[model samples]
Target: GVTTFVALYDYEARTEDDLSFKKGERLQILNSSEGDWWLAHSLTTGQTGYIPSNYVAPS
Candidate 1:
């Protein structure tokens, strides 16, 4: 229910080359997996970044 803001997944370390994006940029959700925590990805590309579970709130 809280995933209405098109959640952009998060990763601790930069996993892929395309994972680079500006702070206010938007990327599609490719996929996600549970590691140390949940991770969201970009659909148009393969990339990952970190967003705290509590910090991620739909706007």
Candidate 2:
């Protein structure tokens, strides 16, 4: 898998279901994914969502 989960800053998203990768802790991961957008999860919630391009690269 090209997708890799790592430690990074967090975003306090102000929306519903529209969340992203968590920071300072253990983030979750799906079976397999891409580099465009990672299947990342929250720190403690284990709530997964379409993460951002901040760490991911579109190539």
Candidate 3:
């Protein structure tokens, strides 16, 4: 399970053990659970936290 994901929307840390990210930013899809939440880490900044599932597209 080595899927790289794209951020579909720019998001702030609205909270959720969460990290903020920019739209169009590539994220390391560390784990995506349920169907609406995800754990993501940015490849450039080493920033990792909760990412919205709807805000991302895995590729």
Off by over 4 Å in 3: none
> Which segments of candidate 2 are over 4 A away from where they belong?
1-6, 13-18, 53-59
* Span of ten consecutive residues with least summed lDDT in model 2: 50-59
Alpha-carbon RMSD of each model: 5.8, 5.5, 2.0
Query: Is 1 or 2 the stronger prediction by lDDT?
Result: 2
Highest TM-score: give the candidate number.
Answer: 3
TM-score: the better of candidates 1 and 2: 2
Q: For residues 1-59, could you state the per-residue lDDT of candidate 1 as single tens digits?
A: 32323334443444543344433333443334543333445433455654333323344
- Overlapping backbone residue pairs in candidate 2 total 0
Q: Ranking under lDDT, best-scoring first? A: 3, 2, 1
Top candidate by lDDT? 3
Ranking by TM-score: 3, 2, 1
Clashes of each: 6, 0, 0
Candidate 3 Cα deviation (angstroms), residue 14: 1.0
Better of 2 and 3 by TM-score: 3
